[PDB]
Amino acid sequence: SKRALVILAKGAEEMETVIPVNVMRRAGIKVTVAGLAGKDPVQCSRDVVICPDASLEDAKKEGPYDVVVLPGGNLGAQNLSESAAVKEILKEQENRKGLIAAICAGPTALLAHEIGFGSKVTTHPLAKDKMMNGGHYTYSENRVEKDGLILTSRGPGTSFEFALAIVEALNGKEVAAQVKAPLVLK
Amino acid sequence: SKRALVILAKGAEEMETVIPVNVMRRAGIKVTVAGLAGKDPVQCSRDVVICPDASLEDAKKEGPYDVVVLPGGNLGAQNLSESAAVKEILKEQENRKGLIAAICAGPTALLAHEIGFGSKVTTHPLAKDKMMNGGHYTYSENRVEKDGLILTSRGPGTSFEFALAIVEALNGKEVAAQVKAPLVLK
């Protein structure tokens, strides 16, 4: 089975955490929700408290992963951007030609860690200027953007599209379509 | 501020829990996530573990609520349907002419507790036959259905529509529109 690492920091957008985790699990992907700070519960942006499966340290030992997923939320993304452990994981994933997926403010951690320069990316509209500082990426307004192994998306309301794009990249279009149908998406 | 009670049982659909909680908090609603079983963490349908704000018992004491929200997930809804405490809360809410909102399999707990008979309702397609046993409701295929104080919806992919309908009912159309825009919904 494919494997996904979802890195969960304080201040993460909980919709952008839970929608990808759940949809990837519906696709039969083995997902590890890893707490940036440790195994303790994480207070998300709108105060939902989620208990991670593992600390990031332990989850790293259990790699490699077919995708590393970065939720958004301004403060969650700032915490991801400040983390040396996140830097190391993303560099490794990039070096092994593995998928990296980030949503809303999440892509700004790619900038912080110098990941995927020269890619077309999207972000939340409000995170554009941060992402574009230095002109290291080309901006897109697509709801989901995928430039090779860098997969980005815009906001809570693009989270299902984002998650299904991850499923398609890992498990193919037919599995994505089968996972999509019971969701009652428009 | 308006107040919402979200009742969280083992096996709840975590997307249908988190999307309404987060969107209602964006709308300035004071939301209490109450654990059916107690204050301990809840293992949702796709294994996301959420820590409730309170036990339901304590949250009841802190009522009344402007809305009671029932997430879906087959097993979560079964747990809600089996609960005498849920029965009592829903009967009280109905008696005081307060809104009740339920999504996916969640509406089947209205049937179990004899709430809102004679209403037009929707459910997940797979929960239709359970909901319709006895012909106590009239079925709808609308993505969100609202018949007075009974507000229902279909699935994970209708959760934003459902949550925004709750916000409109409580705080009005303008607040709903202002909350909606930053979400990047299609």
Swiss-Prot record, chains A, B:
GO cellular component, one term: PML body
Annotated consequence of substituting C51A: Strongly reduces chaperone activity and ability to eliminate hydrogen peroxide
Annotated phenotype, changing H124A: Strongly decreases enzymatic activity
Bound cofactor: record note: Deglycase activity does not require glutathione as a cofactor, however, glycated glutathione constitutes a PARK7 substrate.
Superkingdom: Eukaryota
Outcome (variant: A177T): No effect on detoxification activity on methylglyocal-adducted CoA
Consequence when changing K128R: Partially compensates for loss of stability
Keywords per UniProt: Acetylation, Autophagy, Cell membrane, Chaperone, Copper, Cytoplasm, Disease variant, DNA damage, DNA repair, Endoplasmic reticulum, Fertilization, Hydrolase, Inflammatory response, Isopeptide bond, Lipoprotein, Membrane, Mitochondrion, Neurodegeneration, Nucleus, Oxidation, Palmitate, Parkinson disease, Parkinsonism, Phosphoprotein, Protease, RNA-binding, Stress response, Tumor suppressor, Ubl conjugation, Zymogen
Stated family: Belongs to the peptidase C56 family.
Job description of the protein: Multifunctional protein with controversial molecular function which plays an important role in cell protection against oxidative stress and cell death acting as oxidative stress sensor and redox-sensitive chaperone and protease. It is involved in neuroprotective mechanisms like the stabilization of NFE2L2 and PINK1 proteins, male fertility as a positive regulator of androgen signaling pathway as well as cell growth and transformation through, for instance, the modulation of NF-kappa-B signaling pathway.
UniProt-recorded name of the protein: Parkinson disease protein 7
Gene name linked to the record: PARK7
